[PDB]
Each structure stands twice: as C-alpha cells, then as structure tokens.
Design a protein around this ligand. Structure first.
Ligand SMILES: [Cu+2]
Ligand SMILES: [Cu+2]
Length: 477
C-alpha cells in the first residue's frame, strides 16, 4: 500500500463519440504527453494525448470515419472485432502516411458489443500500441437497449482499459522489440487503467457495468474483486451472452473484452484487482501478488440498471460434418526461445522461473508475408479452424479478423460458459484450439484479413497470416 499514493486519481472516461450531421466521425492520430506518477512522458493518442474515444455506432447505420495521421511515421487503423470488408479492415496493408488522410465507411451489421481499435502497422504494432494508441467501439442495437442494463456512460456504465507499461528512469515509455520481447512479450511493472495508475471511480448504489479490455501487449490478466464478490459476465468480445454467467475470477487474454456487472451495495470501497497468472514473465513482481486495477468508491445516489435473467439468443452450433477444416500450426524458432529465455533470466534472475529474430515466429512454418495470403475462405460458409501450439509453451491469444466466431475447443478443453458465445480470440498454449468461423464480407488480396497471435511482439516478428474471402475460389478461374 505504501507503494501507491494515498489519494487515487479519478478514473478518466473516454469520450463517447457519435456521428455528426453529415454521418461522419473524425479521428486524429497524434503525439502529445501524459503524466504518470508525477513524471511527464511522450504519449500518442486518438483525439487526444493517450488512448482514444469510444466510437459509438448503431447497428444498420453507415458512418464514414475520417482518419488523419498526424504522427511523423506511418500507421494503420484496425477495428478489432468488427465484421467489415477487408478494404476497411485497416490491417498492415491499410497504410496512412504521415500527414495523410483516409476515409472509411463502416456499415455496422453485427450484434451490440464492445469492440476496440488500434494500429496494425507491419512490424511496429507493439510499439504503436505501447506508445498509447487504442480506442473503443461501442456497437448498439435495439435488443441491448431494451434490456435496461446500466447505461449512464462514465457513471454506471464504465469502460475499463487495462494496460501495463515499462518506463525508464527519465519517465518515458521504454519500448523495445528485441530478442527477449520477441520471445515473451513487452511487459512492465506499472499498471494503467484508462491511462491512470490505480484510479478511483465514483459508483452509484446498484449494478455497476464494467466494459473490460485487456489492452496489454503481452500480459494476460485475471480480474476479481478485493473482497471476492462475484462478477456477472454479460458479454464477451462479440457481444451479449445468452444469460449472465456468474464468476469469481475472470481471465482475460490480450485483446479480449468482457462486460461484467458488479454489485455496489453498501458504502465500503472495494477494488477491482488482477490475480497472478501462469504466463512466462507475468508473475514476476509486482504481479506475483494480486494487483489493484481500480478502486470502486460507492456514492450516495442509486442507479437502476438491471441484471436481466435473459440477455440474448445465440444460434445453436450447426452440424460440423462437411465443413472446411483449416489447420494452423503456431511455432517459434528454437533459437528465439533459447535466447529470449536467456535474456529473461539475465534481466530478472532466478525468479523468472520461480513457478534474425524479426521473422522467428511463424504459422505453418511461415513468418508473415504481406504479399502472399495463405489461403482463400468462402464467404458465408462455416469453417472449422484448428490452431495448434503443440511444440512451444508460450501463450498465444489467437485472433481472426472479419468475424465473431464460436469456440468449439479452447486449448484442448470445451470453452467455459462465458467464453462459449461470440469471440474473436481463442487461447492457444501448448495444445490445440478449434473455432467455428464464418466471414460475412469479402477481403481481396490487396486488402486481406489477418489471423494472428495477439501477443503483439509475436505478431510483429512473424506470427500472422493473411487470408482472402470471396464467394468462391476455383483454380480454373
Ligand atoms: Cu482484429
Ligand atoms: Cu504468440
């Protein structure tokens, strides 16, 4: 406790940004500065110094987003979790030059969900996210609004973007893509919640809705409350579960979102915390013990948001016979594993095991080739993708663009109930995962979809593939 200041900063709330009268939204990508622990640091942000707004979209309504790159280097803008055509997907092919402008029209056609957006610059995604770039996407539809969930933005409906950073002694963000981070990821000893260190949020009595995003480059998290009151999971990456799922702890992989309701009953403050995980590098101090994320400070007013018995209906799993099967093998060059582990041991000592690297991470023996999509999927068809991490012991949250899928097997076991709805990420760690995926939109070679590990340093050093989606593919044509 003595390590944190007695008074907590107020939890910053990203602005909720909707369409203007011309059905447009403006996003600037820029460099500014932020203060962490009383030290100012250069940071990057969308419409601001750090992080970004929550872009709010209505299902079935078109928006054009005008994107202005005001950095001195190239970037891209990817809408993580959005079912949109490859042309507006903002993967590594969607380059926006410094001083450049690109406009994309999003025709939102998926269930209400909390998605997010971030850079996807080839080989530099880890650095650009670490510098500060990430924003949220709130998709709404008539269905979710009829539920009368907690819905006062920044009061009882609260975005919670949780990220670690490593800072140097001069206060600046200390990012590196090197042999150690290419192996185990970039991680640090300071946890940010909407950009603030251990902030406090003033919560009315009643249900409090938290839209949780693990926005770390490489660190997996496991949310719980300080007094072990339950979290009611109401939504995953791609939207509402069929019914709330009660959990006492909530593991969240890099890039995943969950929305939870937690009870604010009496006046006693309590914390959202993250519990120690079993992931290389990640249980090193200060994360060897439960670590505070946010203080919830009850206030006098009440709020009347509901915890509904029923939230939504999801389609039953279809027959799996006859469906196209795609096999993806994740791998790391053994030299990278050896050297990266050596560096981790040098940097942290014995506690690290207490419980050309630029193309050394691979899928099906291939480090990402932006000019060679690995295959073509058929639009509108359910496919079974089988992703294996047998062979190494690293954690790979495997993410597929252009879709919200259904997990069939997560790392060799059936998915937990709260992970059996709409997901865009599945854990792969020394075992095999299978997902049921359908692509509703096209993506040509020039604007292909990505499928990749979302441990950003793995992605940046090769663990990504491109794929196209069209109505059909036949070699004669
Ligand atoms: Cu994505
Ligand atoms: Cu990985």
């Amino acid at each position: 406790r003595a390590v944190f200041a007695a008074e907590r900063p107020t939890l910053p709330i990203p602005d909720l940004l909707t369409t203007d009268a011309r059905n447009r939204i403006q996003l600037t990508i820029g460099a500014g500065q932020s203060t962490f622990g009383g030290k100012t640091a250069t940071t990057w942000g969308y419409n601001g110094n750090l992080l970004g707004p929550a872009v709010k979209l209505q299902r079935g309504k078109a928006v054009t987003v005008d994107i202005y790159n005001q950095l001195t280097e190239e970037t891209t803008l990817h809408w993580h979790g959005l079912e949109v055509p490859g042309e507006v997907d903002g993967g590594p092919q969607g380059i926006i030059p410094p001083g450049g402008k690109r406009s994309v029209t999003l025709n939102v056609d998926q269930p209400a969900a909390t998605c997010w957006f971030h850079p996807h610059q080839h080989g530099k995604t880890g650095r650009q996210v670490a510098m500060g770039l990430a924003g949220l996407v709130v998709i709404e539809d008539d269905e979710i609004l009829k539920l009368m969930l907690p819905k006062q933005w920044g009061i009882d409906d609260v975005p919670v973007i949780v990220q670690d950073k490593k800072f140097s002694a001069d206060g600046q963000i200390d990012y590196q893509l090197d042999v150690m981070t290419a192996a185990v990821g970039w991680f640090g000893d300071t946890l940010l919640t909407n950009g603030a260190i251990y902030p406090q949020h003033a919560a009315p009595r009643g249900w409090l809705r938290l839209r949780l995003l693990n926005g770390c480059n490489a660190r997996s998290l496991n949310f719980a409350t300080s007094d072990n009151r339950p979290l009611y999971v109401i939504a995953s990456d791609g939207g509402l579960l069929p019914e709330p799922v009660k959990v006492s702890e909530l593991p969240v992989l890099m890039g995943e979102r969950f929305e939870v309701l937690v009870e604010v009953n009496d006046n006693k403050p309590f914390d959202l915390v993250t519990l120690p995980v079993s992931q290389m590098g990640m249980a090193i101090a200060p994360f060897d013990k439960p670590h505070p994320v946010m203080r919830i400070q009850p206030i006098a007013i009440s709020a009347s948001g509901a915890l509904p018995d029923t939230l939504s209906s999801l389609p039953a799993l279809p027959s799996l016979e006859g469906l196209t099967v795609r096999k993806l093998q994740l791998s790391m060059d053994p030299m990278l594993d050896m050297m990266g582990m050596q560096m981790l041991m040098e940097k942290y000592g014995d506690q690290a095991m207490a419980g050309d690297f630029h193309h050394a991470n691979k899928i099906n023996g291939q480090a990402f080739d932006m000019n060679k999509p690995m295959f073509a999927a058929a639009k509108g068809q359910y496919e079974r993708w089988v992703i294996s991490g047998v062979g190494d012991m690293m954690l790979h949250p495997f993410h597929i663009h252009g879709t919200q899928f259904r997990i069939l097997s997560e790392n060799g076991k059936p998915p937990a109930a709260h992970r059996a709805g709409w997901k865009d990420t599945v854990k792969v760690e020394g075992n095999v995962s299978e997902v049921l995926v359908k692509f509703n939109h096209d993506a040509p070679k020039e604007h292909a979809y990505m499928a990749h590990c979302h441990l950003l340093e793995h992605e940046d050093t090769g663990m990504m593939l491109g794929f196209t989606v069209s109505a059909w593919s036949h070699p004669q044509f």
